[PDB]
Amino acid sequence: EMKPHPWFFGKIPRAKAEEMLSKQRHDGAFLIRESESAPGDFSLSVKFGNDVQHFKVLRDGAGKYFLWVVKFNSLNELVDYHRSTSVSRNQQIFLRDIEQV
Ligand SMILES: [Cl-]
Ligand code: NA
């Protein structure tokens, strides 16, 4: 074995998520953070090329989490689903864990 997830960063600023992800080599390297502009909501930040893309983690009426259409009982399941289904509607981007310092 039991290990904490390498992708949960708590309340880091959106800008610091961009700073850290920019240094990752591989597209799809990502983190979940707790949004500062919408407290109580999560955001998913993902390196793609020279960019860092940000996704709102949306909630349904029952508290399930989703990005687009498919929803899950946990952030953990949302993240894992998107290791093999693209997070993006404009590119094929699959979540992969950050390298690690
Ligand atoms: Cl896909
Ligand atoms: Na999807």
UniProtKB/Swiss-Prot annotation:
Changing E36K: No effect on the interaction with SOS1. GO terms for biological process: actin cytoskeleton organization; B cell receptor signaling pathway; branching involved in labyrinthine layer morphogenesis; cellular response to ionizing radiation; endodermal cell differentiation; epidermal growth factor receptor signaling pathway; fibroblast growth factor receptor signaling pathway; insulin receptor signaling pathway. The modification N6-acetyllysine is found at K56. GO terms for cellular component: cell cortex; cell-cell junction; centrosome; COP9 signalosome; cytoplasm; cytosol; endosome; extracellular exosome. Ubiquitinated by RNF173, leading to proteasomal degradation and inhibition of the RAF/MEK/ERK pathway. In the nucleus, polyubiquitinated by RBBP6 at Lys-56 at DNA damage sites. The SH3 domains mediate interaction with RALGPS1 and SHB. Residues 7-99 form the SH2 domain. Belongs to the GRB2/sem-5/DRK family. There is a cross-link at K56 (Glycyl lysine isopeptide (Lys-Gly) (interchain with G-Cter in ubiquitin)). This is Growth factor receptor-bound protein 2. Homodimer. Associates (via SH2 domain) with activated EGF and PDGF receptors (tyrosine phosphorylated). Interacts with PDGFRA (tyrosine phosphorylated); the interaction may be indirect. Also associates to other cellular Tyr-phosphorylated proteins such as SIT1, IRS1, IRS2, IRS4, SHC and LNK; probably via the concerted action of both its SH2 and SH3 domains. It also seems to interact with RAS in the signaling pathway leading to DNA synthesis. Interacts with SOS1. Forms a complex with MUC1 and SOS1, through interaction of the SH3 domains with SOS1 and the SH2 domain with phosphorylated MUC1. (Microbial infection) Interacts (via SH3 domain) with hepatitis E virus/HEV ORF3 protein. GO terms for molecular function: ephrin receptor binding; epidermal growth factor receptor binding; guanyl-nucleotide exchange factor adaptor activity; identical protein binding; insulin receptor substrate binding; neurotrophin TRKA receptor binding; phosphotyrosine residue binding; protein kinase binding. Non-enzymatic adapter protein that plays a pivotal role in precisely regulated signaling cascades from cell surface receptors to cellular responses, including signaling transduction and gene expression. Thus, participates in many biological processes including regulation of innate and adaptive immunity, autophagy, DNA repair or necroptosis. Controls signaling complexes at the T-cell antigen receptor to facilitate the activation, differentiation, and function of T-cells. The chain holds residues 54 to 154 of 217 of the full protein. It comes from the Eukaryota. Keywords: Acetylation, Cytoplasm, Endosome, Golgi apparatus, Host-virus interaction, Isopeptide bond, Nucleus, Phosphoprotein, Repeat, SH2 domain, SH3 domain, Ubl conjugation. It is found in: Nucleus; Cytoplasm; Endosome; Golgi apparatus.
